[PDB]
Amino acid sequence: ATIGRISTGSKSLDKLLGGGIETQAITEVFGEFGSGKTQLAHTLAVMVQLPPEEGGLNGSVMWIDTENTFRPERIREIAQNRGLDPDEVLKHIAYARAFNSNHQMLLVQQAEDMIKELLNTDRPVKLLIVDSLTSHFRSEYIGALAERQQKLAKHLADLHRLANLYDIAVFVTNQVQANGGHILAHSATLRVYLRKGKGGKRIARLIDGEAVFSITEKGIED
Ligand SMILES: Oc1cc2ccccc2cc1O
């Protein structure tokens, strides 16, 4: 398949990304608590449902939530201010809460079943969100870094296999603050560092210029 792109909702961020996040890729956004990673996830879950002329892929979404941070009412607001019907947008987001890291890993295998079901339809899965990818692994493997890296490596390999095999954009969030971080090392296809700037602006930089945007009723925008 050709590489598809999903607009982030921000012209600035899209330019930094060469058009948007890519299918057949894992995009990892990392930054401190409150930097806007989950807002970017919510916005992408709407943007992907637009036609290509508007930066989407007419796609369905699967969302794995590890922190109970998915907000349907926020999806509705973004959809309504992106010219879409909010009920339709929500009906094309499959949502699951991961209870722990082992359940999170099983959910990725379950996602493949729905990906296959929708593959030949007019609304194939085009976006798989894992928010937060690392939170359960970090809390469960305190004092056991070697084992944590083994399990994370398999989880990321599963996510890669889905991105490439089914032409999906995988978007993952990772909280990294004071003294923290192996990030995801070199595992993602693309690492985006997100931070707060003056006056509520958010600033994005590729790790391995900078885009600037705001969080608004449209999700994010310049
Ligand atoms: O209905 C489902 C929703 C999911 C969401 C994310 C990951 C896996 C899922 C599996 C489902 O059957």
PDB file of N, CA and C in Angstrom, residues 6-55:
ATOM      1  N   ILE A   6      -2.425  11.234   7.946  1.00  0.00           N
ATOM      2  CA  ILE A   6      -3.558  11.773   8.685  1.00  0.00           C
ATOM      3  C   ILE A   6      -3.158  13.140   9.213  1.00  0.00           C
ATOM      4  N   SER A   7      -3.891  14.160   8.794  1.00  0.00           N
ATOM      5  CA  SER A   7      -3.640  15.487   9.316  1.00  0.00           C
ATOM      6  C   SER A   7      -3.893  15.512  10.818  1.00  0.00           C
ATOM      7  N   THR A   8      -3.062  16.266  11.530  1.00  0.00           N
ATOM      8  CA  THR A   8      -3.210  16.446  12.969  1.00  0.00           C
ATOM      9  C   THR A   8      -4.222  17.516  13.328  1.00  0.00           C
ATOM     10  N   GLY A   9      -4.710  18.273  12.348  1.00  0.00           N
ATOM     11  CA  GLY A   9      -5.558  19.414  12.603  1.00  0.00           C
ATOM     12  C   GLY A   9      -4.822  20.737  12.616  1.00  0.00           C
ATOM     13  N   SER A  10      -3.490  20.708  12.696  1.00  0.00           N
ATOM     14  CA  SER A  10      -2.655  21.903  12.731  1.00  0.00           C
ATOM     15  C   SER A  10      -1.782  21.928  11.485  1.00  0.00           C
ATOM     16  N   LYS A  11      -1.869  23.021  10.720  1.00  0.00           N
ATOM     17  CA  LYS A  11      -1.021  23.159   9.538  1.00  0.00           C
ATOM     18  C   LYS A  11       0.445  23.142   9.925  1.00  0.00           C
ATOM     19  N   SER A  12       0.772  23.796  11.034  1.00  0.00           N
ATOM     20  CA  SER A  12       2.147  23.844  11.507  1.00  0.00           C
ATOM     21  C   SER A  12       2.669  22.443  11.818  1.00  0.00           C
ATOM     22  N   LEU A  13       1.935  21.693  12.631  1.00  0.00           N
ATOM     23  CA  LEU A  13       2.371  20.342  12.960  1.00  0.00           C
ATOM     24  C   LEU A  13       2.403  19.456  11.720  1.00  0.00           C
ATOM     25  N   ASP A  14       1.410  19.594  10.840  1.00  0.00           N
ATOM     26  CA  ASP A  14       1.417  18.803   9.614  1.00  0.00           C
ATOM     27  C   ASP A  14       2.679  19.054   8.800  1.00  0.00           C
ATOM     28  N   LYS A  15       3.097  20.312   8.680  1.00  0.00           N
ATOM     29  CA  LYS A  15       4.312  20.594   7.919  1.00  0.00           C
ATOM     30  C   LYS A  15       5.522  19.917   8.548  1.00  0.00           C
ATOM     31  N   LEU A  16       5.641  19.993   9.875  1.00  0.00           N
ATOM     32  CA  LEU A  16       6.735  19.309  10.556  1.00  0.00           C
ATOM     33  C   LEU A  16       6.730  17.814  10.243  1.00  0.00           C
ATOM     34  N   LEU A  17       5.541  17.221  10.134  1.00  0.00           N
ATOM     35  CA  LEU A  17       5.378  15.791   9.893  1.00  0.00           C
ATOM     36  C   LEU A  17       5.348  15.420   8.417  1.00  0.00           C
ATOM     37  N   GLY A  18       5.574  16.368   7.515  1.00  0.00           N
ATOM     38  CA  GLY A  18       5.497  16.057   6.102  1.00  0.00           C
ATOM     39  C   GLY A  18       4.106  15.771   5.586  1.00  0.00           C
ATOM     40  N   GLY A  19       3.071  16.265   6.263  1.00  0.00           N
ATOM     41  CA  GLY A  19       1.702  16.092   5.810  1.00  0.00           C
ATOM     42  C   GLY A  19       0.761  15.561   6.872  1.00  0.00           C
ATOM     43  N   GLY A  20       1.321  14.958   7.912  1.00  0.00           N
ATOM     44  CA  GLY A  20       0.517  14.307   8.931  1.00  0.00           C
ATOM     45  C   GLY A  20       1.187  13.045   9.425  1.00  0.00           C
ATOM     46  N   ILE A  21       0.556  12.320  10.344  1.00  0.00           N
ATOM     47  CA  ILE A  21       1.150  11.050  10.750  1.00  0.00           C
ATOM     48  C   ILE A  21       0.939  10.008   9.659  1.00  0.00           C
ATOM     49  N   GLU A  22       1.885   9.083   9.542  1.00  0.00           N
ATOM     50  CA  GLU A  22       1.901   8.120   8.450  1.00  0.00           C
ATOM     51  C   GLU A  22       1.221   6.812   8.825  1.00  0.00           C
ATOM     52  N   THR A  23       0.515   6.226   7.860  1.00  0.00           N
ATOM     53  CA  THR A  23       0.198   4.814   8.000  1.00  0.00           C
ATOM     54  C   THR A  23       1.473   3.988   7.829  1.00  0.00           C
ATOM     55  N   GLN A  24       1.389   2.707   8.181  1.00  0.00           N
ATOM     56  CA  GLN A  24       2.572   1.850   8.162  1.00  0.00           C
ATOM     57  C   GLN A  24       3.691   2.448   9.014  1.00  0.00           C
ATOM     58  N   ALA A  25       3.318   3.058  10.139  1.00  0.00           N
ATOM     59  CA  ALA A  25       4.300   3.683  11.016  1.00  0.00           C
ATOM     60  C   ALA A  25       3.733   3.762  12.422  1.00  0.00           C
ATOM     61  N   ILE A  26       4.629   3.744  13.407  1.00  0.00           N
ATOM     62  CA  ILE A  26       4.290   4.090  14.785  1.00  0.00           C
ATOM     63  C   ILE A  26       4.806   5.491  15.039  1.00  0.00           C
ATOM     64  N   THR A  27       3.904   6.400  15.395  1.00  0.00           N
ATOM     65  CA  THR A  27       4.290   7.733  15.833  1.00  0.00           C
ATOM     66  C   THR A  27       4.157   7.782  17.346  1.00  0.00           C
ATOM     67  N   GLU A  28       5.265   8.079  18.029  1.00  0.00           N
ATOM     68  CA  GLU A  28       5.317   8.177  19.482  1.00  0.00           C
ATOM     69  C   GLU A  28       5.405   9.646  19.839  1.00  0.00           C
ATOM     70  N   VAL A  29       4.440  10.134  20.605  1.00  0.00           N
ATOM     71  CA  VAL A  29       4.507  11.474  21.165  1.00  0.00           C
ATOM     72  C   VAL A  29       4.820  11.342  22.643  1.00  0.00           C
ATOM     73  N   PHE A  30       5.813  12.092  23.103  1.00  0.00           N
ATOM     74  CA  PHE A  30       6.222  12.041  24.493  1.00  0.00           C
ATOM     75  C   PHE A  30       6.403  13.453  25.025  1.00  0.00           C
ATOM     76  N   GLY A  31       6.248  13.576  26.332  1.00  0.00           N
ATOM     77  CA  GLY A  31       6.339  14.855  27.003  1.00  0.00           C
ATOM     78  C   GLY A  31       5.738  14.730  28.386  1.00  0.00           C
ATOM     79  N   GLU A  32       5.818  15.829  29.123  1.00  0.00           N
ATOM     80  CA  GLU A  32       5.344  15.834  30.503  1.00  0.00           C
ATOM     81  C   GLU A  32       3.827  15.705  30.578  1.00  0.00           C
ATOM     82  N   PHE A  33       3.352  15.362  31.774  1.00  0.00           N
ATOM     83  CA  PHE A  33       1.933  15.445  32.078  1.00  0.00           C
ATOM     84  C   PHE A  33       1.405  16.823  31.691  1.00  0.00           C
ATOM     85  N   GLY A  34       0.281  16.841  30.982  1.00  0.00           N
ATOM     86  CA  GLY A  34      -0.350  18.094  30.613  1.00  0.00           C
ATOM     87  C   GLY A  34       0.156  18.735  29.340  1.00  0.00           C
ATOM     88  N   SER A  35       1.051  18.078  28.603  1.00  0.00           N
ATOM     89  CA  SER A  35       1.605  18.682  27.398  1.00  0.00           C
ATOM     90  C   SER A  35       0.642  18.663  26.217  1.00  0.00           C
ATOM     91  N   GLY A  36      -0.420  17.860  26.270  1.00  0.00           N
ATOM     92  CA  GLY A  36      -1.392  17.802  25.196  1.00  0.00           C
ATOM     93  C   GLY A  36      -1.390  16.522  24.389  1.00  0.00           C
ATOM     94  N   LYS A  37      -0.709  15.476  24.854  1.00  0.00           N
ATOM     95  CA  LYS A  37      -0.619  14.252  24.067  1.00  0.00           C
ATOM     96  C   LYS A  37      -1.997  13.653  23.826  1.00  0.00           C
ATOM     97  N   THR A  38      -2.816  13.570  24.875  1.00  0.00           N
ATOM     98  CA  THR A  38      -4.156  13.010  24.724  1.00  0.00           C
ATOM     99  C   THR A  38      -5.057  13.905  23.872  1.00  0.00           C
ATOM    100  N   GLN A  39      -4.864  15.227  23.917  1.00  0.00           N
ATOM    101  CA  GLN A  39      -5.611  16.100  23.010  1.00  0.00           C
ATOM    102  C   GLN A  39      -5.262  15.805  21.555  1.00  0.00           C
ATOM    103  N   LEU A  40      -3.985  15.547  21.272  1.00  0.00           N
ATOM    104  CA  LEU A  40      -3.601  15.189  19.915  1.00  0.00           C
ATOM    105  C   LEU A  40      -4.239  13.869  19.500  1.00  0.00           C
ATOM    106  N   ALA A  41      -4.259  12.890  20.407  1.00  0.00           N
ATOM    107  CA  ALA A  41      -4.931  11.627  20.126  1.00  0.00           C
ATOM    108  C   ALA A  41      -6.409  11.843  19.795  1.00  0.00           C
ATOM    109  N   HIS A  42      -7.134  12.596  20.641  1.00  0.00           N
ATOM    110  CA  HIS A  42      -8.547  12.862  20.371  1.00  0.00           C
ATOM    111  C   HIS A  42      -8.732  13.518  19.007  1.00  0.00           C
ATOM    112  N   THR A  43      -7.850  14.457  18.654  1.00  0.00           N
ATOM    113  CA  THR A  43      -8.002  15.156  17.379  1.00  0.00           C
ATOM    114  C   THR A  43      -7.775  14.211  16.205  1.00  0.00           C
ATOM    115  N   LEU A  44      -6.741  13.369  16.288  1.00  0.00           N
ATOM    116  CA  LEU A  44      -6.476  12.416  15.212  1.00  0.00           C
ATOM    117  C   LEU A  44      -7.635  11.452  15.017  1.00  0.00           C
ATOM    118  N   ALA A  45      -8.298  11.057  16.111  1.00  0.00           N
ATOM    119  CA  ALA A  45      -9.420  10.127  16.019  1.00  0.00           C
ATOM    120  C   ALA A  45     -10.583  10.712  15.238  1.00  0.00           C
ATOM    121  N   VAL A  46     -10.678  12.039  15.180  1.00  0.00           N
ATOM    122  CA  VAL A  46     -11.652  12.698  14.318  1.00  0.00           C
ATOM    123  C   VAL A  46     -11.086  12.916  12.917  1.00  0.00           C
ATOM    124  N   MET A  47      -9.867  13.474  12.824  1.00  0.00           N
ATOM    125  CA  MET A  47      -9.302  13.839  11.524  1.00  0.00           C
ATOM    126  C   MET A  47      -9.258  12.655  10.571  1.00  0.00           C
ATOM    127  N   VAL A  48      -8.941  11.458  11.078  1.00  0.00           N
ATOM    128  CA  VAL A  48      -8.788  10.306  10.193  1.00  0.00           C
ATOM    129  C   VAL A  48     -10.087   9.970   9.474  1.00  0.00           C
ATOM    130  N   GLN A  49     -11.230  10.426  10.011  1.00  0.00           N
ATOM    131  CA  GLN A  49     -12.541  10.116   9.453  1.00  0.00           C
ATOM    132  C   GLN A  49     -12.937  11.062   8.327  1.00  0.00           C
ATOM    133  N   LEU A  50     -12.170  12.131   8.106  1.00  0.00           N
ATOM    134  CA  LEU A  50     -12.407  13.028   6.989  1.00  0.00           C
ATOM    135  C   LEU A  50     -11.950  12.370   5.690  1.00  0.00           C
ATOM    136  N   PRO A  51     -12.419  12.860   4.548  1.00  0.00           N
ATOM    137  CA  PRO A  51     -11.888  12.376   3.270  1.00  0.00           C
ATOM    138  C   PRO A  51     -10.474  12.885   3.059  1.00  0.00           C
ATOM    139  N   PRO A  52      -9.723  12.283   2.133  1.00  0.00           N
ATOM    140  CA  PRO A  52      -8.337  12.737   1.906  1.00  0.00           C
ATOM    141  C   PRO A  52      -8.217  14.209   1.549  1.00  0.00           C
ATOM    142  N   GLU A  53      -9.201  14.771   0.842  1.00  0.00           N
ATOM    143  CA  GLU A  53      -9.141  16.180   0.480  1.00  0.00           C
ATOM    144  C   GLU A  53      -9.068  17.077   1.701  1.00  0.00           C
ATOM    145  N   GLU A  54      -9.514  16.586   2.851  1.00  0.00           N
ATOM    146  CA  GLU A  54      -9.485  17.344   4.092  1.00  0.00           C
ATOM    147  C   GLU A  54      -8.463  16.797   5.076  1.00  0.00           C
ATOM    148  N   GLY A  55      -7.581  15.904   4.628  1.00  0.00           N
ATOM    149  CA  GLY A  55      -6.527  15.386   5.472  1.00  0.00           C
ATOM    150  C   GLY A  55      -6.820  14.084   6.186  1.00  0.00           C
TER     151      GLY A  55
END
